[PDB]
């Protein structure tokens, strides 16, 4: 009966140590020899990000693109280091030579892709994500990808879990919804929590399922296949 698969951000597939190096290196490209810590200029930015998202959540989309860029210049001026003009040609080339995924996603994508519509839903701009994905090497692996930027309205508004069912073509009961944060609710879908290191134990009761890795999304899909 479920028909398809979808997961919440790019965190469930890449890694932490992977996506703390891209951040790291996008940082030291930025600054050079300029005199700041790199490792506090990303603390600091990565501060600010999490303000930003908070205070546009639930909000009519803005591009993600022009909030970061914001902060971005904020810093600049506050630090004194001139303002990257292509931070985004920057990223995107880190997240290329250092982006790391998690060991399982690519097989576990494959063998869910060909069974069921598998698709990723992001709280981002639809081309710069896209264009990450394709940079990670799984732009392909998906059936879609839903952004709120198509939605109109930045996570937790429902319209972007609506659209993603729409494109699937499914009722939510018929899908089940991956992903690392306790969102999808009221909405019909099966909530598999992913809890790779065993330190969300407190939200364990926020989610139907909860797996250590990708693998066992297979087996609970497979198990509620049967049932």
């Given at each position: 009966m479920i028909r398809a698969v979808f997961f919440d951000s790019l965190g469930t597939l890449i890694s932490v140590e992977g996506a703390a190096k891209v951040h790291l290196k996008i940082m030291e490209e930025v600054l050079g020899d300029y005199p700041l810590n790199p490792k506090t200029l990303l603390d600091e930015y990565e501060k600010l990000a999490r303000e930003a998202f908070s205070n546009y959540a639930?909000?009519?989309?803005?591009?993600l693109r022009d909030i970061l860029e914001e902060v971005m210049r904020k810093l600049a001026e506050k630090y004194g280091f001139k303002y990257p003009e292509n931070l985004w040609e920057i990223s995107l080339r880190m997240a290329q030579r250092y982006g790391e995924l998690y060991p399982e996603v690519v097989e576990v994508l494959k063998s869910l892709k060909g069974k069921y519509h598998v698709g990723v839903i992001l709280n981002r701009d639809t081309e710069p994500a896209t264009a990450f994905l394709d940079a990670l090497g799984?732009?392909?692996?998906?059936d879609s990808i839903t952004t709120s930027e198509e939605a109109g309205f930045f996570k937790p508004h429902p319209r972007i879990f609506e659209l993603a069912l729409k494109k699937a073509g499914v009722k939510g009961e018929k899908a089940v919804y991956v992903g690392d944060n306790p969102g999808s609710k009221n909405l019909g879908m099966t909530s598999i929590l992913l809890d790779r290191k065993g330190?969300?134990?407190?939200?364990?009761?926020?989610?139907d399922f909860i797996v250590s890795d990708l693998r066992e999304v297979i087996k609970i899909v497979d198990e509620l296949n049967g049932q």
């Open positions: 639930g909000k009519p989309y803005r591009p799984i732009k392909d692996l998906f330190e969300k134990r407190e939200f364990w009761d926020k989610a």
